Ligand binder design. Structure first.
Ligand SMILES: O=C(O)[C@H](O)[C@@H](O)[C@H](O)[C@H](O)CO
Ligand SMILES: O=C(O)[C@H](O)[C@@H](O)[C@H](O)[C@H](O)CO
Ligand SMILES: [Mg+2]
Ligand SMILES: [Mg+2]
Lengths: 397, 397
């Protein structure tokens, strides 16, 4: 019942992961993802020094109380380090509760709303032709949906083209030209449609680099290609940033992988400025908070599109697949396969087949951590890149 | 020119402080406050492991570029841990810049706008009588302004009454009744006015415990007592929370000590829902960011009221006083005196006289850190309390 022990595990089976483990007096345990790419040790310290000591002796079944205790109790509310710490606890407690209930997590949430969970794959290449080759191979793999990114002529490096974003100890320095990208990007989607037809879902990630009127122009330009979404058009700390885009294009819009709170997107949703909300479990306060975000989204026809990169661990992925299985307003689940070393450290029972995930049936979220294996891979610092304009201006990566 | 070294110092001369020191190749150095009460080691890790390595080799003079580099470069934007780390770097770089210019910091910002910086003192007591005794005592010390808090009959513990909030390793557990507080509080201000008259500035901190209509009720009830401000009426992640209060009372409102970004308060300011913005340098992204916040506030007659508790170090206080000396739309500066041990660890040249601060004249922000002395006071974990309603509901402390 009560929490006997709680501790973090930091491991680098291909890239860094931070995991919270919670053990009850009865011996049942649960785990939560706590990985915050490029800032990992900040969450590890938040948990180790400040949260973990407060968890000892608490009733593990008190999920809601623990969430509020950590969210309100921190005094300094919201934020990526804060909410990732809270998310790790929350995921671990839901894991415990589902185990206690003898049910897979999706059953505890209200049962399945779908028989499988559609994903998309990253297709990338230096030239449009290179990208098209990748689309072909993934379609052969059974993917119904692909994200397409390709190099921009006249730009040395562009987002999503070589791919492990955090591939340097210190931030790599990329250079950017918005105008060259705006002129080129539509050619990628035209080429994809010409070769692969209309049935395929095609996604694109603008990755924060445009101003709103620039994103409006781009949305308009890509209307003929019927994208599944155009993602992260503009930095959105000021939520009104989406308004001009929405008023000028019918290309569907996705945002929110960089968010950690319903307060980051309440207006985006209520004003109907987006079609997909991307904030995932480990950065968005866990199951407890994301259920609330998804529900708000549902009132406005907005669907979930969980961020699912390699820098969220299989713990997040398994939990996410359970959530995806239940949530009425599911949109899509992003999939970037983990390394074999990562998969082995995090035994799990979710399955991928024919372009879709199937939720596990084991009690809990179905993921565990092999601590002794984890210990074979010590932490290695790795930072996300920064992006600069051609004049040296520090821009948005 | 270039940064050759950067590191944190953690010390507990009466309570925990975290400081960042940056040193250049010419041997000049600056320091910045990085203290985040009750979550101190999360910021320490954020700086040590992720920020400090990226500072080495950077041009010390590039304050703006460094701020953007850390702010945008982090990818996960905003948050108390994030923005405190950024603030610490920013403060240290401004310290260096001022030293390089051979000027006290206020000169660098645009020079002096006032001859002294008005403060307010905390006056607290179990009963109203106890509090009134403390007001008299502080008026004797020359304070022109006092915050008043007193116990609520029928409630064991209330905010600001016995005072160091973080007085426990793990969070102390307080019990709360809104209804008893609402009936009682107006009696305190009535008594202050009866004994001390009209000329004294009287402030009160609601400390997050009310709903909007409750705070509207309170604001109206205390109008006859003409408070300088009513602070932190309601949790304000949803900034619209202030609207009903502002529509129902003319008691001036203050908010923001728990904010870390202009995006936490842009709407509060533009809609004229507040009179004072309380976000301080060390939690609000430093001088660079707070200049922008203050300037935004100025367009709407909003004034600065920096949070100034013991849990922001003399480094923040010195920098704050410099800032207060320049900023046109200065309102007031909170003052909770630090312990002698703290003042010793952080030698400084700002002065307190007759209820006001006088800015230092030494180049830099005028504060330094005695690292040898700091080493004599090891970190001691201390958490902020939580607040529960009478039925056990985890509430806002
Ligand atoms: O849509 C996505 O998958 C994201 O943009 C990732 O590529 C992020 O850049 C990375 O997860 C940050 O750590
Ligand atoms: O107005 C104030 O001085 C604040 O409310 C402080 O009392 C905070 O509670 C404390 O600084 C949290 O660390
Ligand atoms: Mg993305
Ligand atoms: Mg306060």
């Amino acid at each position: 019942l009560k929490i006997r022990d709680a501790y973090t595990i930091v491991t680098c089976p291909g890239r860094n992961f931070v995991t919270l483990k919670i053990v009850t007096e009865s011996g049942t345990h649960g785990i939560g993802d706590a990985t915050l790419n490029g800032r990992e040790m900040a969450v590890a310290a938040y948990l180790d020094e400040h949260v973990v000591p407060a968890l000892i002796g608490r009733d593990a079944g008190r999920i809601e109380d623990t969430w509020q205790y950590l969210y309100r109790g921190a005094y300094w509310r919201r934020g990526p380090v804060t909410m990732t710490a809270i998310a790790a606890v929350d995921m671990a407690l839901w894991d415990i509760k589902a185990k206690a209930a003898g049910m897979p997590l999706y059953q505890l949430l209200g049962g399945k709303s779908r028989e499988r969970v559609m994903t998309y794959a990253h297709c990338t290449g230096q030239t449009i032709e290179d990208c098209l080759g990748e689309v072909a191979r993934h379609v052969e793999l059974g993917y119904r949906a692909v994200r397409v990114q390709s190099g921009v002529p006249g730009i040395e490096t562009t987002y999503g083209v070589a791919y492990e974003p955090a591939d340097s100890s210190l931030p790599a320095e990329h250079v950017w030209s918005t105008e060259k990208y705006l002129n080129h990007a539509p050619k990628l989607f035209a080429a994809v449609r010409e070769r692969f037809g209309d049935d395929l879902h095609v996604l694109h990630d603008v990755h924060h680099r445009l101003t709103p009127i620039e994103a409006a122009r781009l949305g308009k330009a890509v209307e003929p290609y019927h994208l599944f979404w155009l993602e992260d058009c503009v930095p959105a700390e000021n939520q009104e940033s989406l308004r001009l885009i929405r008023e000028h294009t019918t290309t569907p819009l996705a945002i929110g992988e960089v968010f950690n709170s319903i307060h980051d997107c309440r207006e985006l949703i209520q004003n109907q400025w987006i079609d997909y909300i991307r904030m995932p479990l480990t950065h968005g306060g866990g199951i407890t908070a994301m259920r609330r975000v998804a529900d708000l989204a549902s009132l406005y026809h907005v669907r979930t599109g969980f961020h699912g990169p390699t820098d969220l661990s299989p713990v997040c992925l398994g939990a996410a697949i359970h959530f995806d299985t239940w949530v009425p307003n599911f949109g899509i689940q992003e999939h970037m396969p983990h390394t074999d070393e990562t998969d082995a450290v995090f035994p799990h029972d979710y399955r991928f087949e024919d372009g879709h995930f199937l939720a596990g049936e084991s009690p809990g979220h179905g993921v565990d951590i092999d601590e002794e294996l984890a210990a074979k891979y010590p932490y290695e610092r790795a930072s996300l890149p920064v992006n600069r304009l051609e004049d040296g201006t520090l821009w948005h990566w």
